[PDB]
């Protein structure tokens, strides 16, 4: 479609000659620590690239970090903070679900319960965590709906909120992520609300992040290798 009224209001090169590849190194809380490669402009004395990498947020499937496929529908965002030269080191930045699974579990004829909590971890990191649960049809329910009363929903939200506050205030996102990978918090939340309501598909989705204290060098290098 050449049509262009040239309302502009050759010195051409190949930008790929002045570029190269860095390597993404995952935290030791994950198994497959070799994530991938990132394309970067060549280093310049006036404008060093190492400044340019830091702040990058790579988005990788969780199953790509642990080899299994039980974590297929999760997703983790890593933050580039420290570059060792031809290889850079990444810290945890956030967590999320895949929209496919989320829409797969958000089905009709059952009430979804959302618990939202903003807390501070063991260190100065400040997190926001969303938990989503779905009422479960009993294994004997001839009634075809599986709705939950507002009182049950409020009780469930209270329980999930207190559980998340407990499990965040008692550990750091190193330990918190090492806890998120085997999704033991989901099982604990489901067990704590077994008496209130069945609560199928108790999941923790979109673990956000809002603050970072200064840099936290020593643990960052300790988190790798």
């Amino acid at each position: 479609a050449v049509g262009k009224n040239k309302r502009l209001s050759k010195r051409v090169v190949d930008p790929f000659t002045r570029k190269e590849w860095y390597d993404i190194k995952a935290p030791s809380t994950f198994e497959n620590r070799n994530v991938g490669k990132t394309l970067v402009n060549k280093s310049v004395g006036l404008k060093n690239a190492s400044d340019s990498l830091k702040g990058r947020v790579v988005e990788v499937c969780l199953a790509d970090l642990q080899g299994s496929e039980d974590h297929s529908f999760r997703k983790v965002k890593l933050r580039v903070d420290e570059v060792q030269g031809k290889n850079l080191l990444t810290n945890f930045h956030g967590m999320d679900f895949t929209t496919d699974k989320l829409r797969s579990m958000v089905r009709k004829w059952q009430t979804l319960i959302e618990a939202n909590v903003t807390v501070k971890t063991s260190d100065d990191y400040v997190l926001r965590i969303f938990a989503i649960a779905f009422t479960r049809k009993q294994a004997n329910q001839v009634k075809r709906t599986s709705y939950a009363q507002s009182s049950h929903i409020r009780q469930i939200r209270k329980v999930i909120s207190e559980i998340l506050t407990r499990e965040v205030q008692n550990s750091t996102l190193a330990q918190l992520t090492s806890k998120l990978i085997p999704e033991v918090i989901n099982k604990e939340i489901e067990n704590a609300t077994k008496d209130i309501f069945p609560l199928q598909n108790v999941h923790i989705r979109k673990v956000k992040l809002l603050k970072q204290p200064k840099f936290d060098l020593g643990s960052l290098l300790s988190l790798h290798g």
Binding site: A1, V2, G3, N5
Partner: protein, 267 residues
């Protein structure tokens, strides 16, 4: 005979705006002679003909006349062109008409030369056309320069001196163009004697009428005095009339009267 495209290649280029003379129409589309380039036909698709919805083929095609066009795809093994007419902007057609007019003037001049000399137009283009286009970028601009500055034909080998001589004769006879630089001065004099001052300013202005640029003070009304010059270079007349303005102001200020500027020297 009419052949030998103006531009660099007989076959066209990619995305080059072209310039069509339609000959006939088939069911698929219009096969159209290309006049910007040498002779080779282009295919204008029916679905890519009209800006508006297609309703009357012959109303828009106008078999036997010239129009604007744009090339989309080219074939560089045997010769085929895909063309469009819908996708022409409002402003591009103007540059298309001017390019057509200048290229057609050059074509007519050199076809006249070839018909007089009975040598194929391609050979005359070999000796005249594209070395000139390499030197100046446009054969018509170089023709205008040769009208003014004859160093244009230096460094090029013509088939014969007669070719260049008769080309110069034709270009001087047909491509003959001097811009009328006109200004208006308001004499607001109220002093005792101004007719003598007006005559002195007249003489001061008219004495500087050079051999090629004759500046004349024409008289129409009492306040409005016209200053006329034939600027051949268009960059000297304005200074001539500015000097005339300085002279008339110098003459008028000391006598007692005043003068005002109404229209400065402009093309």
């Amino acid at each position: 005979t009419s052949h030998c495209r103006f531009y660099e290649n007989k076959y066209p280029e990619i995305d080059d705006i072209v310039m069509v003379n339609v000959q006939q129409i088939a069911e698929m589309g219009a096969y159209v002679k290309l006049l910007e380039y040498d002779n080779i036909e282009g295919m204008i698709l029916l679905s890519e003909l009209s800006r508006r919805r297609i309703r009357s083929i012959q109303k828009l095609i106008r078999v036997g006349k010239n129009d604007v066009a744009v090339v989309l795809r080219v074939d560089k093994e045997k010769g085929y062109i895909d063309l469009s007419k819908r996708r022409v902007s409002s402003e591009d057609i103007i540059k298309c008409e001017e390019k057509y007019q200048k290229s057609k003037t050059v074509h007519s001049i050199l076809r006249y030369c070839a018909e007089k000399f009975q040598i194929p137009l391609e050979e005359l283009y070999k000796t005249i056309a594209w070395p000139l286009s390499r030197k100046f970028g446009h054969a018509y601009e170089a023709f205008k320069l040769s009208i003014i500055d004859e160093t244009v034909w230096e460094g090029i080998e013509p088939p014969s001196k007669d070719v260049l001589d008769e080309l110069k004769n034709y270009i001087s006879k047909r491509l003959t163009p001097a811009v009328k630089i006109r200004a208006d001065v308001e004499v607001s004099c109220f002093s005792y004697e101004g007719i003598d001052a007006i005559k002195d300013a007249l003489k001061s202005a008219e004495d500087m009428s050079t051999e090629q640029m004759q500046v004349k003070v024409k008289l129409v009304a009492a306040p409005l005095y016209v200053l006329t010059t034939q600027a051949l270079d268009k960059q000297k007349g304005i200074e001539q009339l500015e000097s005339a303005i300085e002279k008339i102001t110098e003459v008028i200020t000391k006598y007692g009267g005043v003068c005002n500027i109404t229209m400065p020297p402009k093309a």
